[PDB]
Amino acid sequence: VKPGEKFDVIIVGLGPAAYGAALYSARYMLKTLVIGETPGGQLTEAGIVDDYLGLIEIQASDMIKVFNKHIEKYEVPVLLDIVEKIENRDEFVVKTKRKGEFKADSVILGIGVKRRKLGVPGEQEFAGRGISYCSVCDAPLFKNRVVAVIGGGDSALEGAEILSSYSTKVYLIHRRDTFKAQPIYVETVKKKPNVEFVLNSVVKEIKGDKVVKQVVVENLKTGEIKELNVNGVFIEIGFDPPTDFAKSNGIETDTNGYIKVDEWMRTSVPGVFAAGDCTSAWLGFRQVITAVAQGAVAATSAYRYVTEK
Amino acid sequence: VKPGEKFDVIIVGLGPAAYGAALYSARYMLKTLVIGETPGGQLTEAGIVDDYLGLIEIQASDMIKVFNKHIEKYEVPVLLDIVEKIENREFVVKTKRKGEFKADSVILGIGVKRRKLGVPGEQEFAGRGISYCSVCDAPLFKNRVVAVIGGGDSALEGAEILSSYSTKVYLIHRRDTFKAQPIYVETVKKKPNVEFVLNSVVKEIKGDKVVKQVVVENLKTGEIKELNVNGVFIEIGFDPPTDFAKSNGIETDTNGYIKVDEWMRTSVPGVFAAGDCTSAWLGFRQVITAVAQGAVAATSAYRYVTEK
Numbered sequence A: 001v002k003p004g005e006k007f008d009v010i011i012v013g014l015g016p017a018a019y020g021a022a023l024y025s026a027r028y029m030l031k032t033l034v035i036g037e038t039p040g041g042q043l044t045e046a047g048i049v050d051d052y053l054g055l056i057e058i059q060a061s062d063m064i065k066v067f068n069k070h071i072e073k074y075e076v077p078v079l080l081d082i083v084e085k086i087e088n089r090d091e092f093v094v095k096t097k098r099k100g101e102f103k104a105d106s107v108i109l110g111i112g113v114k115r116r117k118l119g120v121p122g123e124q125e126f127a128g129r130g131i132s133y134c135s136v137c138d139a140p141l142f143k144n145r146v147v148a149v150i151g152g153g154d155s156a157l158e159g160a161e162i163l164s165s166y167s168t169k170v171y172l173i174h175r176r177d178t179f180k181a182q183p184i185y186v187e188t189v190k191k192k193p194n195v196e197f198v199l200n201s202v203v204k205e206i207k208g209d210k211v212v213k214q215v216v217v218e219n220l221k222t223g224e225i226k227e228l229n230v231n232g233v234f235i236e237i238g239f240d241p242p243t244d245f246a247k248s249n250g251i252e253t254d255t256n257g258y259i260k261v262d263e264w265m266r267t268s269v270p271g272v273f274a275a276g277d278c279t280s281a282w283l284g285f286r287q288v289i290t291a292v293a294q295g296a297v298a299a300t301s302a303y304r305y306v307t308e309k
Numbered sequence B: 001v002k003p004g005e006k007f008d009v010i011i012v013g014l015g016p017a018a019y020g021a022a023l024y025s026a027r028y029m030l031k032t033l034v035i036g037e038t039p040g041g042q043l044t045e046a047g048i049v050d051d052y053l054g055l056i057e058i059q060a061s062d063m064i065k066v067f068n069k070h071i072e073k074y075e076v077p078v079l080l081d082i083v084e085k086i087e088n089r090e091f092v093v094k095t096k097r098k099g100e101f102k103a104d105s106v107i108l109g110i111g112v113k114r115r116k117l118g119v120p121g122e123q124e125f126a127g128r129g130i131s132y133c134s135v136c137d138a139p140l141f142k143n144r145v146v147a148v149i150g151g152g153d154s155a156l157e158g159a160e161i162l163s164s165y166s167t168k169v170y171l172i173h174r175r176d177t178f179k180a181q182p183i184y185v186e187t188v189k190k191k192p193n194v195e196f197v198l199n200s201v202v203k204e205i206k207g208d209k210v211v212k213q214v215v216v217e218n219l220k221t222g223e224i225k226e227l228n229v230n231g232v233f234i235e236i237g238f239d240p241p242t243d244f245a246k247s248n249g250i251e252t253d254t255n256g257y258i259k260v261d262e263w264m265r266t267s268v269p270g271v272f273a274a275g276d277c278t279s280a281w282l283g284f285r286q287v288i289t290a291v292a293q294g295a296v297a298a299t300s301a302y303r304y305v306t307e308k
């Protein structure tokens, strides 16, 4: 591909939603270009994926390999870079951090979201070695083990509820006295015999040997520091939507800051579609299967928009 | 399993949506039971599947096998039978010949039934050049001549994508007008390699090992023509499970599909649905989206049960 050159559609991102959209866009014979920074997106920080039907207990690394090979069978050009802006015109102009500008009749955003990190020692050290950011995804991996879940929202509460059906013991560590998660989940989890609430507390450090062995916690009231032996730590403290990219490109966001889409993945800007974690659809529920399917839908909406145009 | 046993969730159907919901249901630790008549559902009539990301050019029969192995890894019991009734008494699911089962929730993945055409050769050339899905199989017919039967959105969109891959397309329709959206008609109309064959019907499909011709009859003149084609795409629609829905107190939309909101919730609390029996992404009949809706319906089933 050459700086310049127009495409029927340019896909921003290289996570599951992006591959999903790429596969369908290429199969509809739209001239397609994928521009994204990290191949696999969040799959780069996953370990074993067993929630994508048909790809049994597959290594995330292998999942990325086969997703890329699948779109490469259709010869979709993939540029590894960052999209800086998406300019409206008649036709779209998409600027990258290096590779230049490209034109397109439609654009599909699969930019994902940034996971919020605790920012404490041991966090990167043990990522993928006892630390997970997805309870629904990795809970089955902790049957009869001891774990801690960190946060006080719907995903931390639902995480603890799921982990309670697998783990011997679950510590729900949250920094406030109260929870913003739905009261229903709170009441539900409190009633669990193997769940212990550790309120007004924050994690100070995550320790271990080859893997996680303990979480050091500080009670923010009593200043008291204590160590809990755990086999795993699930960080469920939320995400940062790409509200700045959206606003910066004239794209409407919902009341949560996510890219606003309708059923068929259409954004507020005619000709611009979006898929995966960056959208308002199925907020909360972030899985590979749903992002890949939303990509197929976004690609379908772009095909209809381009062919009708 | 045994009649009378209780489950957290019972999934009806054994298609991609059902596999999808069973996978997430078992992983949420919901005691799960799948009751479906035909394993793989519509996948039974497909050939190579190359639109489900990560499963490259896989035979539909092998997609069915790995889908089943994925849920059997979680020991989800599968009962091969037909669900006759779903009653709210918790739920009591009545099957045709295996008894009744109890459940706190139910996920419907019953799909739709393809409208049969029924013309000589249709059976003789199954998998032999006859397809029931233009978007799925178009890439397999690059530089080949094909015919598309139908006059709706499916047929027109099919003729549109096939016009891009194929040499030429014969759009054969029995009416003088189209049931497809006007925008679809004018778009196809502008494709130089799409030839409308209106007020016409297919009389039969011929070939040797594979399809080689289609015999069409003009309803207004009785004239007959043999058209040489390498492929025949039958796009005449599907019949939703309206009657099943109404018989079970489930609301349907204006097209007769089971109505669901964004979370795959039907009009009945505790009853969810996924895949092409639902009103969501109506007409988009893809394995990938059906599997995803199953994950969503299993998640809504999970939230419902844990909160009950």
Ligand SMILES: NC(=O)c1ccc[n+]([C@@H]2O[C@H](COP(=O)([O-])OP(=O)(O)OC[C@H]3O[C@@H](n4cnc5c(N)ncnc54)[C@H](OP(=O)(O)O)[C@@H]3O)[C@@H](O)[C@H]2O)c1
Binding pocket: A116, A117, A118, A150, A151, A152, A153, A154, A155, A156, A158, A175, A176, A180, A202, A236, A237, A238, A239, A256, A283, A284, A285, B303
């Ligand atoms: N309907 C459902 O079943 C469901 C399930 C899961 C998620 N969701 C949705 O998805 C969205 C995001 O879910 P979410 O619960 O992950 O995000 P969230 O609603 O933002 O809650 C996460 C919480 O973690 C805490 N936290 C943040 N940074 C922290 C830090 N550095 N150290 C310790 N604690 C920290 C915060 O609590 P404080 O700021 O209060 O201290 C924060 O609000 C929500 O809008 C939610 O409704 C829905």
Ligand SMILES: NC(=O)c1ccc[n+]([C@@H]2O[C@H](COP(=O)([O-])OP(=O)(O)OC[C@H]3O[C@@H](n4cnc5c(N)ncnc54)[C@H](OP(=O)(O)O)[C@@H]3O)[C@@H](O)[C@H]2O)c1
Binding pocket: B115, B116, B117, B149, B150, B151, B152, B153, B154, B155, B157, B174, B175, B179, B235, B236, B237, B238, B255, B282, B283, B284
């Ligand atoms: N919005 C979109 O872009 C889109 C795209 C694809 C599919 N869809 C959805 O998919 C659903 C079903 O597919 P569809 O729209 O193609 O079905 P459809 O709306 O029923 O149109 C198919 C047509 O095939 C003709 N036909 C039926 N039986 C026939 C036979 N035995 N011999 C010859 N011709 C026959 C019929 O025309 P006559 O009855 O007039 O003879 C029939 O209306 C739709 O209801 C729609 O919601 C939507």
